[PDB]
Design a binder for these strands. Structure first.
Length: 175
RNA sequence: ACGGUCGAACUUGACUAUCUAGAGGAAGUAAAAGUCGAGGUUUCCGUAGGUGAACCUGCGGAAGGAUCAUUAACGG
């Protein structure tokens, strides 16, 4: 029997409560694993049973709930379940340029854009998903889509205006 | 006429300022269609370098630049 454990932070506990149903129903029904929430250590516990085939889904199942730990929505984690080549790439905003204080918050605002729209646009361009943590940035998609969204984000935090990045990312999407 | 006093004014030098005569020199403008062969587009500030400027680059600073989403406890 193979076992997976994934830690949950404190701020991810309440969303884990309100989205638990749509977390275990994709696992036990059409994927067939054993789920529980280890409440003492605050871990997510994955085990095999006698009803397991296609063992790789096991690993996929782990990444499933790991996406929900990182801040992603439930349906995007289902997209990790359904598809076979869908990856996570993560980097800090300061890992590409040293920004301190208000400049770092302004870089966050340039990634997000007013109303979120800029960030929103990049998903409709790149068929990825993006989580903006406190300093971290997480990208969910295929490898070329990850590369394209990562380049768009890095240019957004170089100092390039979000309008220019909007136009050029609409242009580069057509290849 | 000796002397004293007040003292214009004169001569010579310095320091000044003006008026005039000036060879010569360096600029601009008009006449010469004679001759030879850019680029930036986030914006800056203080420094130092890259050929003066321009722009680029190293360090430090600014916004006078477009914040979406989760987010007390519910283990000890």
């Amino acid at each position: 029997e193979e076992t997976r454990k994934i830690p949950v932070p404190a701020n991810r506990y309440t969303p884990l409560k309100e989205n638990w149903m749509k977390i275990f129903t994709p696992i036990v029904e059409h994927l067939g694993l054993q789920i529980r929430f280890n409440l003492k250590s605050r871990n997510v516990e994955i085990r095999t049973c006698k009803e397991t085939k296609d063992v790789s889904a096991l690993t996929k199942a782990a990444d499933f709930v790991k996406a929900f730990i990182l801040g992603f929505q439930v349906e995007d984690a289902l997209a990790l379940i359904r598809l076979d080549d869908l990856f996570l790439e993560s980097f800090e905003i300061t890992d590409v340029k040293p920004l301190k204080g208000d400049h770092l918050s302004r870089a966050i605002g340039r990634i997000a854009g007013k109303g979120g729209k800029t960030k929103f646009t990049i998903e409709n361009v790149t068929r990825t998903r993006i989580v903006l943590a406190d300093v971290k940035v997480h990208i969910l998609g295929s490898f070329q889509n990850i590369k394209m969204a990562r380049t768009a984000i890095c240019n957004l935090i170089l100092g390039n205006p979000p309008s220019k990045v909007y136009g050029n990312i609409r242009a580069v999407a057509s290849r």
